[PDB]
Amino acid sequence: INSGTTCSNDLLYSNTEISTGVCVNYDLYGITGQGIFKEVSAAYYNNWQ
Amino acid sequence: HTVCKSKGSIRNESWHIDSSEPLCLFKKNFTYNVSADWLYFHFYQERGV
Ligand SMILES: *[C@@H]1O[C@H](CO)[C@@H](O[C@@H]2O[C@H](CO)[C@@H](O)[C@H](O)[C@H]2NC(C)=O)[C@H](O)[C@H]1NC(C)=O
């Protein structure tokens, strides 16, 4: 209990829904900040990127 | 020592003895092209990461 490597994702981080229009807090892959989101069609990404 | 299943000759694959799976932090598999010339790898550490 309260140890080991077997945990669960039942915390507040439960795959929340994205939103556009208002700047919110950022926790995207160990990065913080704020900013308005805007949907844009981009195709310069890769699998590891 | 470690052998490969591709036409084994004498020895067998045996490098550790563990009757139970210990606490593991990372374990995964990746794929690559089986028909290539050479494979490059790069390892390092910084600030404990
Ligand atoms: C794995 O590597 C081989 C050789 O490097 C790739 O075969 C080449 O594929 C290209 C794309 O059609 C051809 O133009 C070359 O003539 C092929 N070379 C040979 C020697 O066959 C193969 O496509 C690679 N596979 C993957 C999944 O990356």
Q: What's the 3-state SS for chain B?
A: CCCCCCCCCCCCCCCCCCCCCCCCCCCCCCCCCCCCCCCCCCCCCCCCC
Q: B 7-26 residues with CB below 8 A of A?
A: 23-25
Experimental approach: cryo-EM
Closest chain A residue to B21 measured between Cα atoms? A5
Do B14 and B27 meet the contact criterion of CB atoms below 8 Å apart? no
Stated in angstroms to one decimal place, the resolution of this structure is 3.3
Structure tokens at B40: 């490059």
**What does each C-alpha distance from B46 to A8, B41, B43 come to in angstroms?**
28, 17, 11
Best B20, B21, B23, B27 member to test A by mutation, with max A CBs in 10 Å, is B23
Is the minimum distance from the CB of B34 to ligand 1 under 6 angstroms?
no
Nearest alpha carbon to residue A49 among A29, A35, A32: A29
